[PDB]
Amino acid sequence: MDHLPIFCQLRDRDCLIVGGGDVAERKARLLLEAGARLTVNALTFIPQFTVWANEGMLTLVEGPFDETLLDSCWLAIAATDDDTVNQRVSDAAESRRIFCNVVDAPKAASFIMPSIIDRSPLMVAVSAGGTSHVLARLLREKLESLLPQHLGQVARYAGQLRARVKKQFATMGERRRFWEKFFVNDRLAQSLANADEKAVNATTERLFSEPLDHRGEVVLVGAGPGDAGLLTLKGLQQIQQADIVVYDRLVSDDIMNLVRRDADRVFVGVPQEEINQILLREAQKGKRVVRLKGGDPFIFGRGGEELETLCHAGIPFSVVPGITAASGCSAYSGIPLTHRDYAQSVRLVTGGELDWENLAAEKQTLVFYMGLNQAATIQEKLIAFGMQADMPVALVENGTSVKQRVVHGVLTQLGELAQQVESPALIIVGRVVALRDKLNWFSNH
Amino acid sequence: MDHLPIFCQLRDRDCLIVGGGDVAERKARLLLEAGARLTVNALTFIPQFTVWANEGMLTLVEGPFDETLLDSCWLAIAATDDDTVNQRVSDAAESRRIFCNVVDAPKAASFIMPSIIDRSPLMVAVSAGGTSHVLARLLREKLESLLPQHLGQVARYAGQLRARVKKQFATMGERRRFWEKFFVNDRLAQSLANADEKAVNATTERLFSEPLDHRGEVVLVGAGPGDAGLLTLKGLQQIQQADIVVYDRLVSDDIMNLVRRDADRVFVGKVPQEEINQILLREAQKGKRVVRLKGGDPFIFGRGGEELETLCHAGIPFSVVPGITAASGCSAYSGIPLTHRDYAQSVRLVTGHLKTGGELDWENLAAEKQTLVFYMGLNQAATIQEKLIAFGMQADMPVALVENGTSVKQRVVHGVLTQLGELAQQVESPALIIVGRVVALRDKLNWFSNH
Ligand SMILES: Nc1ncnc2c1ncn2[C@@H]1O[C@H](CSCC[C@H](N)C(=O)O)[C@@H](O)[C@H]1O
Numbered sequence: 104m105d106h107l108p109i110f111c112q113l114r115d116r117d118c119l120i121v122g123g124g125d126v127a128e129r130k131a132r133l134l135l136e137a138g139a140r141l142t143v144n145a146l147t148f149i150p151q152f153t154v155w156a157n158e159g160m161l162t163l164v165e166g167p168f169d170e171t172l173l174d175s176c177w178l179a180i181a182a183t184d185d186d187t188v189n190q191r192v193s194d195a196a197e198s199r200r201i202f203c204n205v206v207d208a209p210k211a212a213s214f215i216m217p218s219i220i221d222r223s224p225l226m227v228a229v230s231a232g233g234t235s236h237v238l239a240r241l242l243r244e245k246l247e248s249l250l251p252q253h254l255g256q257v258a259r260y261a262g263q264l265r266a267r268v269k270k271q272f273a274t275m276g277e278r279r280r281f282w283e284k285f286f287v288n289d290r291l292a293q294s295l296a297n298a299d300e301k302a303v304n305a306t307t308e309r310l311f312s313e314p315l316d317h318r319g320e321v322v323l324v325g326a327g328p329g330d331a332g333l334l335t336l337k338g339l340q341q342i343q344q345a346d347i348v349v350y351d352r353l354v355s356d357d358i359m360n361l362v363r364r365d366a367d368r369v370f371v372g373v374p375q376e377e378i379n380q381i382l383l384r385e386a387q388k389g390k391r392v393v394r395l396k397g398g399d400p401f402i403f404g405r406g407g408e409e410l411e412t413l414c415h416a417g418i419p420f421s422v423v424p425g426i427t428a429a430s431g432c433s434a435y436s437g438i439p440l441t442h443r444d445y446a447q448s449v450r451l452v453t454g455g456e457l458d459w460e461n462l463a464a465e466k467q468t469l470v471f472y473m474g475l476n477q478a479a480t481i482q483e484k485l486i487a488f489g490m491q492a493d494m495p496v497a498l499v500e501n502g503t504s505v506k507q508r509v510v511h512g513v514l515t516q517l518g519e520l521a522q523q524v525e526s527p528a529l530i531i532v533g534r535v536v537a538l539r540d541k542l543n544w545f546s547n548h
Numbered sequence: 549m550d551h552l553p554i555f556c557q558l559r560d561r562d563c564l565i566v567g568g569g570d571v572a573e574r575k576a577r578l579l580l581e582a583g584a585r586l587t588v589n590a591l592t593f594i595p596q597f598t599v600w601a602n603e604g605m606l607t608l609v610e611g612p613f614d615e616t617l618l619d620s621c622w623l624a625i626a627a628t629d630d631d632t633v634n635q636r637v638s639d640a641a642e643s644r645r646i647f648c649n650v651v652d653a654p655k656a657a658s659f660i661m662p663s664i665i666d667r668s669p670l671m672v673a674v675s676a677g678g679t680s681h682v683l684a685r686l687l688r689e690k691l692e693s694l695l696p697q698h699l700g701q702v703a704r705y706a707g708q709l710r711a712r713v714k715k716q717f718a719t720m721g722e723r724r725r726f727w728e729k730f731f732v733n734d735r736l737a738q739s740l741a742n743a744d745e746k747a748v749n750a751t752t753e754r755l756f757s758e759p760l761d762h763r764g765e766v767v768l769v770g771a772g773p774g775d776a777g778l779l780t781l782k783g784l785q786q787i788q789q790a791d792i793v794v795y796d797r798l799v800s801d802d803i804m805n806l807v808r809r810d811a812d813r814v815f816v817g818k819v820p821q822e823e824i825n826q827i828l829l830r831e832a833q834k835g836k837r838v839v840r841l842k843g844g845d846p847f848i849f850g851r852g853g854e855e856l857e858t859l860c861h862a863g864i865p866f867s868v869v870p871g872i873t874a875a876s877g878c879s880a881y882s883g884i885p886l887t888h889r890d891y892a893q894s895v896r897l898v899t900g901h902l903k904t905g906g907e908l909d910w911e912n913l914a915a916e917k918q919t920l921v922f923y924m925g926l927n928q929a930a931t932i933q934e935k936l937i938a939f940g941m942q943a944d945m946p947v948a949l950v951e952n953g954t955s956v957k958q959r960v961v962h963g964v965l966t967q968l969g970e971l972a973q974q975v976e977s978p979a980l981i982i983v984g985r986v987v988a989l990r991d992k993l994n995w996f997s998n999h
């Protein structure tokens with residue numbers, strides 16, 4: 104222990120920042136978020152300070168550092184580019200026993216500012232003694248990804264409720280198991296954040312009526328197309344809380360590596376009815392169920408079918424969208440789905456029968472899902488229905504993954520090019536495909 | 549934020565604890581480890597306070613509270629079981645502008661003491677503000693299984709190298725590139741943990757020897773439609789490490805709160821497009837890691853292509869992190885799947901604002917078995933209704949408008965196609981128009997809110 108972390112209550116307390124440039128602006132922003140009664144003293148100010156001053160948010164004192172400005176101070180920050188001024192600030196603060204930070208000199212004064220993860224009233228702070236700002240930031244990034252955005256809502260609502268939980272639960276063992284379920288109920292958190300009382304109270308005494316061991320729900324989570332970094336923050340959080348993860352072939356190994364160590368896994372890679380009942384069966388055993396699907400759940404994912412099974416049974420559900428194959432393949436192949444006036448619309452199409460005259464019309468970007476089989480037919484029909492034979496085409500196999508393959512050419516070679524790839528692959532047809540020679544940044548295989 | 553966390557240097561600074569029971573003993577142990585010059589003022593003391601004052605580790609003042617004991621103090625802790633005494637302490641500390649903790653009353657006084665995870669010199673502090681003692685410990689447990697124990701040795705070694713890093717790398721940019729390699733070298737971490745000095749030195753000399761890439765970079769990052777939970781892990785990594793973030797009005801405040809606190813930020817909401825291109829170009833040429841943070845997905849009606857197409861000729865590295873486009877986010881959060889069973893053979897993402905005297909291909913857009921999603925089409929909703937009808941879309945085709953989709957302020961209105969124009973007057977931008985049979989599924993699949 105070389106530093107003692109404390110969480111200061113600054114609301115309406117006088118604090119002083121010396122300095123008026125970009126560094127001081129960042130510290131002022133932070134102290135204002137904490138409700139400090141802030142004075143800023145500097146020889147000159149960048150315009151953000153005059154804005155705040157004109158909105159009554161702080162006081163400005165233009166001129167040399169005046170150590171009487173510390174007279175009723177609780178905290179001081181020296182944020183100038185002048186070592187001599189910063190040392191004058193820290194000496195004047197030290198003689199008054201005012202905790203003081205010198206931004207460019209962590210061992211020069213009496214406190215250092217840690218990296219902060221804010222879920223107020225819940226807060227986390229990280230500091231390596233000031234000798235590793237990159238390390239503290241790498242930890243902040245991990246923590247920001249793991250703490251749900253609305254955790255603070257549930258933290259505050261916990262107090263509004265501590266009495267009722269003591270009278271329905273006698274032992275401290277059951278009370279702890281109640282808090283465990285309460286704080287990971289992200290649905291209650293989101294309902295609190297939405298200010299939706301009908302949803303809030305519907306979730307609340309469902310927590311008091313259900314037995315403590317029951318936590319039955321289904322979350323559909325979009326895994327994205329392959330790259331584990333394309334999972335959403337909320338997707339990661341949900342798969343870290345699942346009792347049971349139901350997945351298939353199109354969820355990548357990298358994503359599955361993120362699944363919490365002791366979750367049960369069920370591989371359904373199998374008619375849809377079997378899958379719908381698996382989710383129902385697992386949810387009615389009272390378990391927190393995540394159905395992980397490749398890409399986005401509601402784009403040729405049959406996610407709607409999985410959810411109507413559950414609405415029937417009174418099982419709570421939610422959906423976390425994911426990066427669909429079109430978006431992932433577009434970004435990683437350097438083929439934007441729109442560009443300038445090239446396309447008035449993007450068409451996401453599955454390979455009843457397709458309306459070929461419609462697909463052939465000009466000023467579209469066509470994106471075929473599950474169309475490898477019909478790729479010879481697609482070429483033949485588009486040409487017969489008037490698409491210019493020189494229309495650029497591309498096929499992206501295993502888009503966003505470390506084995507992504509991109510082959511490209513013109514419409515007359517589509518059935519040719521399709522044999523060079525296997526599923527999962529996308530076919531993109533449109534003038535945007537010509538941009539790849541300028542926008543290609545990801546390694547090809 | 550409720551509180552500002554700070555990490556205080558207490559070495560040789562006077563602190564006062566009032567009270568002498570088990571609570572006071574726990575706080576005194578903490579202050580003593582931090583190097584505080586400690587006085588403890590109490591009517592009675594439990595035995596542990598006798599062992600400490602025998603070894604000269606603190607000063608005991610046996611008796612009622614003496615507020616003059618605060619006169620030279622930097623921190624005060626009120627740890628009696630007498631609320632009247634605790635409040636006299638906190639009043640006396642407040643008059644002296646001394647940060648003061650009242651252990652049994654976290655909402656009183658002026659600082660709270662967090663739970664600590666110790667990987668010294670690395671430290672992680674957690675508190676819920678006293679609103680919930682339980683949540684802190686549940687979080688504390690998770691964070692300990694997350695932070696390897698040898699993280700302290702990595703941090704310790706970094707502190708030792710800091711002078712040499714500062715001497716050999718003249719700019720903050722070069723130093724940052726070194727540290728980013730240092731802190732993810734798993735072999736160095738293992739050698740430190742094993743006290744293998746030859747292996748430490750071999751990897752260290754190689755790290756110092758590596759030529760650094762002084763080129764900047766432009767990364768286009770899809771922020772998603774608003775809910776900060778819908779940023780990708782890679783997009784969070786990019787904004788947590790950017791030098792400068794160029795962003796616009798359709799990037800939500802919650803996502804902006806995830807940006808590196810130290811990054812410069814340039815707002816280009818209403819800046820013309822060719823000037824955005826120049827900002828990214830010149831900032832990357834200056835060697836900075838630039839993030840262009842865009843609403844939704846960068847390559848769907850986001851002009852991301854225009855922002856990139858100068859860069860390869862300029863020899864400036866770039867990449868793209870895709871994001872959740874408005875269609876996908878609004879779909880999920882409104883209960884309206886974009887595809888379902890035989891309802892749609894395709895999803896059409898259409899712009900409702902055209903350049904020139906441009907006309908959409910209404911005959912093509914009116915076809916059956918599709919879900920139409922119009923972006924920036926609010927001003928055109930009356931025209932969209934009339935044209936779709938005139939080219940034969942059924943008059944009772946369901947429609948929906950999602951305003952601020954995925955945000956806590958999201959609003960959804962719905963009806964049939966002959967109501968589209970009037971429905972659009974009920975929302976404001978940003979809003980998506982969804983046209984198609986899948987809109988009827990909302991009453992079954994809507995989970996997010998009814999506002
Ligand atoms: N990584 C990937 N690269 C290219 N195409 C992919 C892909 N992952 C899925 N696909 C496409 O998606 C089809 C499965 S249908 C499932 C689509 C998914 N819900 C999504 O939103 O993307 C595959 O046949 C293939 O055409």
Ligand SMILES: Nc1ncnc2c1ncn2[C@@H]1O[C@H](CSCC[C@H](N)C(=O)O)[C@@H](O)[C@H]1O
Pocket residue numbers: 773774798842843844845846847848849850872873874875878922923924925950951952953954955977978979980981
């Ligand atoms: N949160 C949101 N809710 C509803 N519509 C949104 C939205 N965010 C963006 N939009 C739509 O997107 C249009 C801007 S065009 C930029 C779209 C972005 N690249 C994307 O992929 O989503 C807006 O006019 C509005 O129609």
